[PDB]
Amino acid sequence: NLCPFGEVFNATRFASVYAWNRKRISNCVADYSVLYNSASFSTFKCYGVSPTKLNDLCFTNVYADSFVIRGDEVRQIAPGQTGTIADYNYKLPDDFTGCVIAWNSNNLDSKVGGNYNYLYRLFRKSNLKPFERDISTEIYQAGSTPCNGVEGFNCYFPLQSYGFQPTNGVGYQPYRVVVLSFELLHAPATVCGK
Amino acid sequence: DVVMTQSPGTLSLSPGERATLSCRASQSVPSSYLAWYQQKPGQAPRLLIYGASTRATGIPDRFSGSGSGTDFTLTISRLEPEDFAVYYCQHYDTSPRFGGGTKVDIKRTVAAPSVFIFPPSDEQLKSGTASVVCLLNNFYPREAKVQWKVDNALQSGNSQESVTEQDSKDSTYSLSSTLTLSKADYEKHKVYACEVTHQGLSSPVTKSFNRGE
Amino acid sequence: DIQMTQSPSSLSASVGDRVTITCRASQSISSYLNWYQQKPGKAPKLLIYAASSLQSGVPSRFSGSGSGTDFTLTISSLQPEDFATYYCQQSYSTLALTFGGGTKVEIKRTVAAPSVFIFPPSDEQLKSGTASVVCLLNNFYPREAKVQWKVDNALQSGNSQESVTEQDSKDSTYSLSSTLTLSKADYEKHKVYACEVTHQGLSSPVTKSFNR
Amino acid sequence: EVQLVESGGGVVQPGRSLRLSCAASAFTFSSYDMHWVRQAPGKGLEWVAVISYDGSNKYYADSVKGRFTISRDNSKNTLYLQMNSLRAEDTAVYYCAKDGGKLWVYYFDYWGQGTLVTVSSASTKGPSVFPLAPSGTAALGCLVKDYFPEPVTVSWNSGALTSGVHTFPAVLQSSGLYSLSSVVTVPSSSLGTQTYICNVNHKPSNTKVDKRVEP
Amino acid sequence: EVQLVESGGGLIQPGGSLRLSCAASGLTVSSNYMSWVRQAPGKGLEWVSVIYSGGSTFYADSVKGRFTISRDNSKNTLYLQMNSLGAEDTAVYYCARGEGSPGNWFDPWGQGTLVTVSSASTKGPSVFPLAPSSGTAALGCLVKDYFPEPVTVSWNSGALTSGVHTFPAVLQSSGLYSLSSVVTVPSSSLGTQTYICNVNHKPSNTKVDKKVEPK
Ligand SMILES: *[C@@H]1O[C@H](CO)[C@@H](O)[C@H](O)[C@H]1NC(C)=O
Ligand SMILES: [Cl-]
Ligand SMILES: [Cl-]
Ligand SMILES: [Cl-]
Ligand SMILES: [Cl-]
Ligand SMILES: [Cl-]
Ligand SMILES: [Cl-]
Ligand SMILES: [Cl-]
């Protein structure tokens, strides 16, 4: 049967980028041509593979990661990028093999009074390794005094809200991102394009 | 990116009035990304307001920020002489951006300057140069005329002036005028005077000294 | 985008030499680096794909190597028909394909001195309003040559245009033409019209002039 | 044996539209992806767009996105590129390229000969040819000035005089037109005995001018 | 006790290199967003660089390829290596914790240090007294012929602050700076109170204490 890409692209609610969702796709037939021409996409970039070649290839597993960031940050969802999102929220490896797809979601994820439910990790001591997910909410220590779980001076909550309002400039508007990763192990393949 | 423009360039108000500083843009910017900074003369900027309307720690209550979308406002109620500074709005789009800044001047009553004249030291004269200094202290407004006279001969082209910004406590100005001569030229003349014309003076004030006395 | 930087921008070699062209990437592109050859006025032609795979029909004297961010194209024995421009092109970002700046392989010959000829504007042109002073540099090598316009010993900055031909098929030399364009009102304003030339094959700057 | 023939190039004013074609031959055209690649005058190569084998998927470079449109007709074995809202930065020679298809990624294995698209509001004006009289050999030539657009073909004695000729590339002067110089060095003995005539032709404006060159 | 103490400013020739320091107390440099913001004479504020706790660095387009931001955790100090300096780089450079973003504003700020890009030479000042005339009296110190800026002047090691006016430096025709610092005091204290001006020219580390007495 068909691979459930629509459950990812057509999901009514998306995850915050710090707690990005991952859908493991296996043992199915994938129709990529219909998937990529469904909705209009503002960002469509593939790395290491052509999007028209996927209908010929087989992979052990395909991962569909999805989250929401703002417009000025879509450029960070790419191999070799740095920044608050790429370092502390969602990191792609330098040899990333897959496609990054994004579209404007101002109508869905912005509110008149501001939608503060979408968060991102603002403070972290070290960078994330590729495909790492950190959902910790421990108080960040920015000084020499330990925080002991109490916010204060040099003691910050690590997450920060976006606050999406539909009249903001496109750089501040929310964008839903879907990252397709194509893993090729020395195991029998389960996802072939057709 | 979004360019934010501050207005007006300069604001001149009396103490106790309400100051309105604007930071506008042609695109709407989320209010959580807006900040205001204050920079007094010779000092580093300090955070006044963040998130458009949240007052920073230790900032007096008379500073309040408001606005959203395309019009953000910094309000300085109960203006004080110490509020003399330049105020910048600040936001982050793809990089930290600062506005052009709004200068807040403080008006006050007319104050006549106190004039003092200083002869050059003997230590400097041994070096071959004579600097004569005239001081105009604590006056308002800034406009003032300083004329150097050497043996009652008006000087031109051998003096330089320097003015301070408004005093943080009394909002006055101070001005220094330095007459520079060679030692040989300084010894050829006896009377050295600076004449001061200012709005607070009903007639020009002249301070002088006699070389060698 | 991924920037592709080729080095050198230009080189001069003779038939039989071993030519190596370098291509650098702003980030790792794995082995997805392709080489192309382009003749003046012709379409590009594929030489190497996937860094090292030789395209069918391309002579074996072409070979590519490298991985990550540094790549190299090698012509073991340069042939007369191999003088062209060679581009590298990354295919890692498949929907943002970018090319390198190119490396033009040229013919190395001995130093040739240019023959400087100057031509005044014809009588048939000065009645339209425009006046163009032309200076010519004929049959010289190498390409690097400076043409300086002096009108009344005043350097005519931002008032002329240069143009260089390709390497000649006979003596492998270049040729340069500088066209000082000015109105007729700017023409009778002055008197002296010279053309200074600085080249590798000249022991001193040569200047060819004429009087109106 | 893979052939690609373009057509539809020419002059166009800014903001107008132009459509290019690319007839393929001697390969399974309905199975390979197709590309468009342009090259500005004196500049390098720039990938424009790509279309899938069946024509269902299209991807464009950011410099032409929402402005150009790629399409293909597999029954006619032709590739199309509808260019709308043309800017002066779009002035380039446009190539179509067949995808290699041997990798997971795109690469061009065969290219078309290319057609020129000159985006400018300047009307197709004919050239004004002026002679260059000579003042130990001598040199003489002709000055093809003020013509739009590229190109103009210049020969001497109807192509009989081949040795010693140097035709220089055109330059875009400040007046939006082009200026070109063509010279030929001849022995100083056969000057009044040998006659020299430069043959200038401008196909976009349909202008053929033959001018005599004498000292 | 939160402080950002800056140093490293002064005179540097065009094309030279300079490294600024920002020693921190009350916060951990390696655990924070740390930025450099500069201010040209008489102009506004311009963000220049930032370094993340995770190691990422970013720069403004005006300094990319010439500046390098770094840190030393054992010294808890932020650095800014400036290369290929020009007249546009002459400014007061501030360091600050944060990046001017939500939950991450510029706070606190360092005191700033002045970088003067000039082909001239560093010169120490000469300090001369402005003796009071023989209710309120005025006295001061003339600080003459120094380069580059700045000089600071205090009175009685900081114990005298009321009525002090230190004028902005003026550029003399010799290319050297000069300023005066004055103070008004009661005339009754001229014989019982000692007045000493403390001049500090940091670019040369020239510190002069000058006793100002009636003549
Ligand atoms: C997702 O929704 C679009 C319309 O919004 C639909 O055309 C598409 O088929 C859906 N995805 C799948 C996998 O069915
Ligand atoms: Cl705006
Ligand atoms: Cl907000
Ligand atoms: Cl400070
Ligand atoms: Cl005033
Ligand atoms: Cl700069
Ligand atoms: Cl720079
Ligand atoms: Cl100073």
Residue numbers in the entry:
A (entry chain E): 334 to 527
B (entry chain B): 1 to 213
C (entry chain L): 1 to 212
D (entry chain H): 1 to 135, 142 to 221
E (entry chain A): 1 to 134, 140 to 220
Copied sentences from the primary study:
S is a large type-1 transmembrane glycoprotein that assembles into homo-trimers (Walls et al., 2020), which decorate the outer surface of coronaviruses. S1 is responsible for target cell engagement, while S2 completes membrane fusion, allowing the viral RNA access to the host cell cytoplasm, where viral replication can begin. S1 contains an N-terminal domain (NTD) and receptor-binding domain (RBD). The RBD interacts with the cellular receptor angiotensin converting enzyme 2 (ACE2), which is expressed on diverse cell types, including cells in the upper and lower respiratory tracts, allowing SARS-CoV-2 to cause respiratory infection.
To understand how 222 is still able to neutralize P.1, we solved the crystal structures of six ternary complexes of 222 Fab with the RBDs for (1) the original virus and bearing mutations: (2) K417N; (3) K417T; (4) N501Y; the 417, 484, and 501 changes characteristic of B.1.351 (5) and P.1 (6). All crystals also contained a further Fab, EY6A, as a crystallization chaperone (Zhou et al., 2020) and were isomorphous, and the resolution of the structures ranged from 1.95 to 2.67 Å (STAR Methods). In the original virus, residue 417 makes a weak salt-bridge interaction with heavy-chain CDR3 residue E99. Mutation to either asparagine or threonine abolishes this, and there is little direct interaction, although there are weak (∼3.5 Å) contacts to heavy-chain Y52 and light-chain Y92. However, with RBDs bearing K417N/T mutations, a buffer molecule/ion (most likely a sulfate in some cases and a glycerol in others) moves to form bridging interactions, which may mitigate the loss of the salt bridge. Rather, it seems that there is little binding energy in general from the CDR3-H3, since most of the binding energy contribution of the heavy chain comes from CDR-H1 and CDR-H2, which interact weakly with RBD residue 417, meaning that many VH3–53 antibodies are likely to be resilient to the common N/T mutations.
